Amino acid sequence: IITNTGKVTGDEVPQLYVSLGGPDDAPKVLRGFDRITLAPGQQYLWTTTLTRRDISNWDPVTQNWVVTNYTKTIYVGNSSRNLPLQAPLKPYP
Amino acid sequence: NLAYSPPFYPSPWANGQGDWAEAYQKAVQFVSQLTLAEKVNLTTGTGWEQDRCVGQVGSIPRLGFPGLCMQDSPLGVRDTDYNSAFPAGVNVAATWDRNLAYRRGVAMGEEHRGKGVDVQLGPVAGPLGRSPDAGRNWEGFAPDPVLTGNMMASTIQGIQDAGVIACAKHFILYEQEHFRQGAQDGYDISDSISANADDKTMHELYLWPFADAVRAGVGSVMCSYNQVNNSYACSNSYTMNKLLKSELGFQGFVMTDWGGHHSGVGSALAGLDMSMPGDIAFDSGTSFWGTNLTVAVLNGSIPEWRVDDMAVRIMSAYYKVGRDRYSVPINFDSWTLDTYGPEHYAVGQGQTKINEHVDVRGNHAEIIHEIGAASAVLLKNKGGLPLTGTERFVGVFGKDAGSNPWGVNGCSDRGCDNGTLAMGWGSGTANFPYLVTPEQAIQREVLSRNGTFTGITDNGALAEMAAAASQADTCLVFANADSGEGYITVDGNEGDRKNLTLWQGADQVIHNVSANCNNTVVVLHTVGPVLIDDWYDHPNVTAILWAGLPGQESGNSLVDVLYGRVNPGKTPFTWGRARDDYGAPLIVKPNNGKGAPQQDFTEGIFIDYRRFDKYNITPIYEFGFGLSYTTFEFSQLNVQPINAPPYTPASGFTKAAQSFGQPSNASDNLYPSDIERVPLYIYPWLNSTDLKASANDPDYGLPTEKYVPPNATNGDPQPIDPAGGAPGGNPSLYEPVARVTTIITNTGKVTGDEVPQLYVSLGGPDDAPKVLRGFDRITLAPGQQYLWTTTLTRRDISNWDPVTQNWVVTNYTKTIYVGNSSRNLPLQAPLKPYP
Amino acid sequence: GNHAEIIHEIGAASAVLLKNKGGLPLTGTERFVGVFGKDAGSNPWGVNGCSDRGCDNGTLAMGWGSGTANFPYLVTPEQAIQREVLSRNGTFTGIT
Amino acid sequence: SALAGLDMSMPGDIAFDSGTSFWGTNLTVAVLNGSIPEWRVDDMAVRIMSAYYKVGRDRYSVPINFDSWTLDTYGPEHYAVGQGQTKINEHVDVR
Amino acid sequence: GNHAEIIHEIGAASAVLLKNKGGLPLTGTERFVGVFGKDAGSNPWGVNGCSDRGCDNGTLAMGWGSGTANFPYLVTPEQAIQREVLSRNGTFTGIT
Ligand SMILES: *[C@@H]1O[C@H](CO)[C@@H](O[C@@H]2O[C@H](CO)[C@@H](O[C@@H]3O[C@H](CO[C@H]4O[C@H](CO[C@H]5O[C@H](CO)[C@@H](O)[C@H](O)[C@@H]5O[C@H]5O[C@H](CO)[C@@H](O)[C@H](O)[C@@H]5O)[C@@H](O)[C@H](O)[C@@H]4O)[C@@H](O)[C@H](O[C@H]4O[C@H](CO)[C@@H](O)[C@H](O)[C@@H]4O[C@H]4O[C@H](CO)[C@@H](O)[C@H](O)[C@@H]4O[C@H]4O[C@H](CO)[C@@H](O)[C@H](O)[C@@H]4O)[C@@H]3O)[C@H](O)[C@H]2NC(C)=O)[C@H](O)[C@H]1NC(C)=O
Ligand SMILES: *[C@@H]1O[C@H](CO)[C@@H](O[C@@H]2O[C@H](CO)[C@@H](O[C@@H]3O[C@H](CO[C@H]4O[C@H](CO[C@H]5O[C@H](CO)[C@@H](O)[C@H](O)[C@@H]5O[C@H]5O[C@H](CO)[C@@H](O)[C@H](O)[C@@H]5O)[C@@H](O)[C@H](O[C@H]5O[C@H](CO)[C@@H](O)[C@H](O)[C@@H]5O)[C@@H]4O)[C@@H](O)[C@H](O[C@H]4O[C@H](CO)[C@@H](O)[C@H](O)[C@@H]4O[C@H]4O[C@H](CO)[C@@H](O)[C@H](O)[C@@H]4O)[C@@H]3O)[C@H](O)[C@H]2NC(C)=O)[C@H](O)[C@H]1NC(C)=O
Ligand SMILES: *[C@@H]1O[C@H](CO)[C@@H](O[C@@H]2O[C@H](CO)[C@@H](O[C@@H]3O[C@H](CO[C@H]4O[C@H](CO)[C@@H](O)[C@H](O)[C@@H]4O)[C@@H](O)[C@H](O[C@H]4O[C@H](CO)[C@@H](O)[C@H](O)[C@@H]4O[C@H]4O[C@H](CO)[C@@H](O)[C@H](O)[C@@H]4O[C@H]4O[C@H](CO)[C@@H](O)[C@H](O)[C@@H]4O)[C@@H]3O)[C@H](O)[C@H]2NC(C)=O)[C@H](O)[C@H]1NC(C)=O
Ligand SMILES: *[C@@H]1O[C@H](CO)[C@@H](O[C@@H]2O[C@H](CO)[C@@H](O[C@@H]3O[C@H](CO)[C@@H](O)[C@H](O[C@H]4O[C@H](CO)[C@@H](O)[C@H](O)[C@@H]4O[C@H]4O[C@H](CO)[C@@H](O)[C@H](O)[C@@H]4O)[C@@H]3O)[C@H](O)[C@H]2NC(C)=O)[C@H](O)[C@H]1NC(C)=O
Ligand SMILES: *[C@@H]1O[C@H](CO)[C@@H](O[C@@H]2O[C@H](CO)[C@@H](O[C@@H]3O[C@H](CO)[C@@H](O)[C@H](O[C@H]4O[C@H](CO)[C@@H](O)[C@H](O)[C@@H]4O)[C@@H]3O)[C@H](O)[C@H]2NC(C)=O)[C@H](O)[C@H]1NC(C)=O
Ligand SMILES: *[C@@H]1O[C@H](CO)[C@@H](O[C@@H]2O[C@H](CO)[C@@H](O[C@@H]3O[C@H](CO)[C@@H](O)[C@H](O[C@H]4O[C@H](CO)[C@@H](O)[C@H](O)[C@@H]4O)[C@@H]3O)[C@H](O)[C@H]2NC(C)=O)[C@H](O)[C@H]1NC(C)=O
Ligand SMILES: *[C@@H]1O[C@H](CO)[C@@H](O[C@@H]2O[C@H](CO)[C@@H](O[C@@H]3O[C@H](CO[C@H]4O[C@H](CO)[C@@H](O)[C@H](O)[C@@H]4O)[C@@H](O)[C@H](O)[C@@H]3O)[C@H](O)[C@H]2NC(C)=O)[C@H](O)[C@H]1NC(C)=O
Ligand SMILES: *[C@@H]1O[C@H](CO)[C@@H](O[C@@H]2O[C@H](CO)[C@@H](O[C@@H]3O[C@H](CO)[C@@H](O)[C@H](O)[C@@H]3O)[C@H](O)[C@H]2NC(C)=O)[C@H](O)[C@H]1NC(C)=O
Ligand SMILES: *[C@@H]1O[C@H](CO)[C@@H](O[C@@H]2O[C@H](CO)[C@@H](O)[C@H](O)[C@H]2NC(C)=O)[C@H](O)[C@H]1NC(C)=O
Ligand SMILES: *[C@@H]1O[C@H](CO)[C@@H](O)[C@H](O)[C@H]1NC(C)=O
Ligand SMILES: *[C@@H]1O[C@H](CO)[C@@H](O)[C@H](O)[C@H]1NC(C)=O
Ligand SMILES: *[C@@H]1O[C@H](CO)[C@@H](O)[C@H](O)[C@H]1NC(C)=O
Ligand SMILES: *[C@@H]1O[C@H](CO)[C@@H](O)[C@H](O)[C@H]1NC(C)=O
Ligand SMILES: OC[C@H]1O[C@@H](O)[C@H](O)[C@@H](O)[C@@H]1O
């Protein structure tokens, strides 16, 4: 949820970064974004769907895309460093 | 003896193909999560005046879904405030400019979006324009399937690009107001008028602009009030299952016109998706759907796949245009402008904040102004226009020049003609933020250049007019003609116009000013054509300008044309000498005893210019005609055949129908205890697990075979229609067959606009001598040359063959005509077969 | 000539504010401005339509008789308030 | 390059106005002498025309109405060698 | 105050058409207008950038010395003509 906490209508660019988890991976990588207009005090539920590719690495050995064993962490916010909310991706039950 | 509408079943289910694939997938994923009761909520409106929008289906609170809001109209947001009032569709048609149509669409969708509206109830392809005097033709575009079809597509794209579902209406053969909901004028008739047309006439005329709508991505279609071969349009399996969903491949949803719904099971199986406003009659507390549709699925009378397809089609439209991306809650109320009031307006309950007074107009005044100006049509000009700006004394004459004394929004649904005319009456309206009159704007312009001015708006004051006309340099005379939806009657005009002549006593005003002023310029604000034979050729009328219904900037857009700053369009309808010249008289008296009146489209394709052309009737001004402030010449016609792959009829089979959830039990469809049941409010729930008692239907209990036609419940793979295969029809119909190039040259002194027009003679004995198949709008400086290139499709040179139930290129030779009106076509060439 | 300028200046400066509890000046941020009354509007017989201005058919800008002159035009309260209101993005209705 | 997956050579010569091409006449000869299978060049042509038909050039085609080398209304078609005088700019407003 | 208006009206009325065989008036629909000359443009040092206007660095609207005044702004020929040409969808270029 994204809420306009100010006094005027405004545009936000919510962003979704993923940490793939491995020791050679980048701390995080952009995998989602949108641009929304919200009036004052308005809420928006922002829904993004990640794909297999968005949580894979390229493995030279098998010459294919793999989801490594490392825990993937999803971060949400409005720049590459303003990421107040985070959560791990768990297996489906 | 009595026209019959054959059955076609089952109701085609949505196929997830082509441009609809992403939206279908999201719809499925959404509807897959739903209970039966939640699914029924998407289908059924909550009752007349029970929520905030003109139409509103229920919510799905378990998933945080607020429902959908359906709001009028085709020319702006109806029944609110701080919105714009756009020009009428007939003016858009008169521009002959697709990109202006597009831009108006974006602008309208933007206002709907900012008010929280999900579906905008337009644009209008039906009425097409069968009869010049039918009351709602101004809401639509033109009596020509190509012109209207192109404007539908452009308009729909605009709307839907702005994040709002469009709704093509009224489907179909809704071509007059009298008897559209049956009994009126003291006549007792059992049922609405019935439009009876043959399969070719349906295909070559009325349905064609719907195919364009569907091909353009239109998210919804509204079925009409009238019957079609004596089955109600919202109950007609041939029009909704066969024509719209099978042949045209429509992948969105079909809603009822308001009170157009006539059955629960029949209508659902005959292809209907949404019931508006959701009750049987306004505030009856009863619905053919709602509780009844919950029961009809529970008791096996309607397959689960069908109520799933209604929901999947509804959410497909929603996802297709991006409704999940534009979060604006409903911030207005259609019933009152009060800030506070009842949510449930019909029963005075649930007091809350119902209008936020949000201003959605932005810079939309600019596209309204442009369309206003470009849409004006200069029918006559002997030097009277353009005005120089330095006339010493300017007279403005006629009530149509000035304002409504009751305020711009003073008469509900614009049901009056008390001044200048910028919009007809009925549901097809919006409230104005202001209206700039011709009087206001002309006075400002004349005074900007120190001219003197008088405005005489009492059409009774003939001595005063004569005297001032004796003294003025240029007399500007204004006259109008009004019409609208049939629930409103203005001076004996019950929606439909009771004649084709001028309103407000303007004829006499034209006569006395002409007599005294040798530089009289007449301006017409008419919903369509009027008979002008008695004054148009008067030597003192030095120009005639049709300005239609220009919306809120009427007079500002008018002065741009008058002073030559913006160039005029072309008439999108015929101006004939006499009424009888149009044919297709209105049925204003019952012609079937006490049964549904019978409107036979005996004329076939022969309406407006096709009729005039066929019978050699000479109009005063022909379809596609208009003068420019310069001259144009047409040269070097070249028709180049393309080696089209031969026509491939479609074949193969649909997927089998699917159910997205597990079957529901009556036990899970009871009113939840925590719900306070609003009186007359339409809900999906059952009083009890006793299905008969919860439906409360006098006729409850028959097995399907006894009241429903064969194959209505067939969920197995179906034959793909040979004329279908994709939205708009078989893709092989849209294969290019010819490339037409022609040179247009501005041979005059001033810059101007031309509307080049391409007409095709299909060539057979029963074809029209020429039908429009292409147009554009170009601006040329003096001496400038332009090569106009049009690519003709197979559909463009085909006829509908009832025998083979497909489109066919006949053996008769086709002739391409190129020029700037339906009768000024100096260049022609046969369409040759590819070597 | 340029005599409009003096007519305007006398028009303005001759106006008398008898009562004012808060209602004037207008701020230029009004969202919906209504104009009410036949005296805000035009004479429908035209500006010089009644001999010697011998009538009261719209806004009153001059009494009747020999103490009169013909108008080159007459800008009404309705026309001008509409213009000012629209130029500040306001909505407007005139009921006359 | 043909066998390595290239489909179109732009601007077509080896060097600018060199009069020589790695394809052109060379590609004709390469196919005729067996060095390049017919399926390869056929696949070059198919892939080119697949793009053309994908976006609907067959629907939206209009003749070229401008010239990249000069704004003059009249000039040479074959700008590089001052040849083939004709109307090369129609000055069409596409804005 | 509103003295811009008299300045504008005198500006215009003071212009002298010395020669004309077709070039004036402009139609307001020319497709490409070129403006040429350092006299069409701005003083790059600002409108009041030379003491007592003691320079000729752009368009000339006033001579130098005590017979001068500071400008609130100066609408140049380039500025106004570009705005007018573009208002009628013409193209434009200014070479100063
Ligand atoms: C098709 O469908 C449409 C839509 O439904 C439909 O539209 C309707 O058309 C109607 C017909 O045109 C139309 O009604 C006409 O309206 C005319 C204007 O109405 C307004 O003004 C009048 C007159 O006001 C004058 O006069 C009165 C005094 O009587 C005074 O009080 C006023 O202040 C004002 O004064 C001025 O004139 C004085 C002298 O008269 C002068 O002394 C003053 O100094 C000053 O100059 C008001 O009374 C109204 O209330 C409106 O405000 C209206 O003029 C016209 O009336 C005439 O015709 C009617 C028949 O249609 C008669 O009932 C009526 O008595 C009038 O009859 C005279 O004129 C006709 C022809 O014009 C003539 O044949 C008559 O014999 C008679 O002649 C005498 O007078 C004329 C001039 O008036 C002289 O020249 C002669 O020599 C004679 O002396 C209509 O009433 C209606 O508005 C419109 N409806 C809508 C909603 O749009 C249309 O009808 C349909 N078409 C068809 C073909 O069916
Ligand atoms: C599960 O729960 C369900 C939810 O409650 C529940 O549904 C209800 O079922 C009952 C039956 O049990 C339904 O009542 C019937 O409705 C029929 C249809 O009425 C409407 O449509 C008529 C036109 O219908 C044609 O077109 C439809 C598609 O539009 C087709 O489905 C139809 O089959 C029919 O097709 C024919 O015509 C087509 C051209 O139009 C053509 O393509 C096709 O090939 C074929 O020729 C309308 O005329 C009708 O309107 C009339 O009546 C209403 C009032 O009802 C008025 O307002 C109108 O002005 C007008 O006069 C509807 O819009 C009815 O036909 C059927 O009526 C017959 O039977 C009842 C007696 O029970 C008689 O009162 C009536 O006079 C009729 O008699 C005729 O047929 C009988 C045979 O039964 C025969 O004896 C007699 O001689 C005579 O000719 C009946 O009213 C009800 O609609 C459903 N309700 C809801 C809410 O959906 C279901 O029962 C439950 N199931 C179980 C198992 O429990
Ligand atoms: C309002 O009322 C009007 C008047 O009723 C409606 O207009 C009618 O609409 C009908 C469609 O619903 C249409 O029906 C067709 O008629 C054709 C021939 O009719 C001729 O006679 C009449 C009357 O005597 C004339 O007035 C008319 O002008 C004609 O001269 C038939 O050829 C059509 O049959 C085919 O389609 C129907 C369904 O539409 C199928 O049931 C039927 O099986 C036929 O289809 C097969 O055969 C054709 C033969 O050429 C094939 O081309 C086709 O693809 C199919 O082929 C399969 O089967 C064959 C073996 O048969 C096999 O070899 C092949 O491989 C395939 O598997 C049809 O009956 C009326 O003509 C039309 N009337 C008029 C005057 O317009 C109007 O729509 C109503 N409107 C509404 C909204 O309700
Ligand atoms: C089909 O469409 C219709 C029409 O939209 C839907 O009907 C509406 O359903 C909603 C949700 O049930 C309902 O809203 C409730 O109105 C109640 C009656 O006045 C309110 O009492 C209730 O408020 C409570 O819940 C809110 C959140 O749900 C809380 O924020 C609030 O404080 C209240 O919470 C108290 O009570 C709840 C139990 O109700 C309890 O759990 C809490 O702890 C707390 O004590 C709702 O806002 C509308 O009234 C309905 N509209 C009408 C006209 O009746 C219908 O739901 C749709 N059908 C389906 C199947 O989806
Ligand atoms: C489901 O859909 C069906 C329509 O297919 C819909 O049927 C309507 O139900 C009402 C209520 O049973 C019917 O009302 C009848 O109307 C006639 C009108 O002249 C009256 O004679 C009857 O009156 C008696 O019964 C009432 C019962 O509530 C009493 O209150 C009253 O005093 C009388 O004793 C009766 O009202 C109506 O005719 C049908 N309509 C049709 C076209 O069949 C049903 O209402 C829908 N269900 C839901 C839950 O919405
Ligand atoms: C087919 O493709 C081949 C390449 O795969 C292409 O080969 C090129 O041909 C030209 C000759 O036609 C070669 O150019 C020569 O280069 C040598 C340098 O080593 C020069 O000696 C040659 O003479 C130049 O200088 C002379 C001075 O007297 C001049 O008289 C003369 O005109 C020349 O300017 C000449 O330039 C070139 O080396 C090859 N290129 C490669 C990369 O192998 C062949 O031309 C193509 N065929 C067609 C029909 O296009
Ligand atoms: C502003 O527009 C209004 C709406 O058009 C105008 O009001 C209308 O004015 C005409 C002429 O005065 C009236 O027509 C008369 O009607 C009577 C009887 O009608 C009665 O029945 C209807 C219901 O069907 C009812 O609504 C009415 O109140 C009446 O009781 C006829 O016998 C006369 O011959 C004549 O035709 C309209 O009735 C009236 N309509 C409304 C909705 O008020 C008004 O004149 C316009 N004002 C200006 C300044 O132009
Ligand atoms: C804007 O206008 C100012 C003032 O006219 C310009 O500055 C002036 O530029 C001229 C030419 O470069 C200078 O001339 C110089 O005179 C000295 C003698 O004092 C001589 O030795 C130099 O070789 C040269 O001829 C002039 O002094 C100078 N004046 C001032 C007050 O600074 C300036 O160039 C203009 N700028 C633009 C961007 O157009
Ligand atoms: C066309 O307009 C002229 C006015 O410009 C009309 O001429 C006047 O007509 C009346 C009535 O016959 C004469 O008494 C006047 O002397 C004429 N005025 C002038 C200034 O010449 C002329 O009659 C109009 N034509 C028609 C057919 O009505
Ligand atoms: C207006 O013209 C009519 C004829 O159409 C005539 O009978 C009448 O006297 C004229 N009235 C005036 C005031 O000129
Ligand atoms: C539902 O039950 C109430 C009584 O609780 C009754 O008044 C109403 O008529 C019933 N509704 C139907 C549709 O039978
Ligand atoms: C139902 O459709 C099938 C074709 O799938 C056909 O065999 C059958 O004749 C139809 N049934 C009736 C009763 O018309
Ligand atoms: C209008 O009149 C005023 C005063 O004479 C004058 O300043 C202005 O230039 C005039 N305008 C025109 C276009 O003649
Ligand atoms: O108000 C919603 C609907 O109302 C009906 O009365 C009209 O015929 C429709 O065109 C309109 O969209």
Residue numbers in the entry:
A (entry chain D): 763 to 855
B (entry chain A): 21 to 855
C (entry chain B), E (entry chain C): 382 to 477
D (entry chain D): 287 to 381
Question: How did the manuscript describe this experimental structure?
Answer:
The crystal structure of ReCel3A is a tetramer composed of two biological dimers. The large number of hydrogen bonds between the protein and the ligand bound in the catalytic centre makes the binding in subsite −1 of GH3 enzymes highly specific. The two catalytic residues in ReCel3A were identified based on homology to other GH3 structures: Asp277 (nucleophile) and Glu505 (acid/base). In the ReCel3A structure, clear density is observed for a glucose unit in the −1 subsite and no indication of distortion from the relaxed chair conformation can be observed. When compared with the corresponding residues in HjCel3A, the plane of the Trp68 side chain has turned almost 90° away from the +1 subsite. This allows aromatic stacking of the Phe302 and Trp68 side chains to form a hydrophobic ‘knob’ and places the phenylalanine residue in the +1 subsite rather than in the +2 subsite as in HjCel3A. The lack of a +2 subsite in ReCel3A could explain the activity profile for the enzyme as a more pronounced cellobiase than HjCel3A. The dimer interface has a total overall contact area of 1572 Å2, to which the modelled N-glycans contribute about 19%. The N-glycosylation chain IV shows the remarkable feature of being buried by the extended C-terminal loop. Two conserved aromatic residues, Tyr720 and Tyr727, on the loop provide stacking interactions with the two buried NAG residues 1201 and 1202.
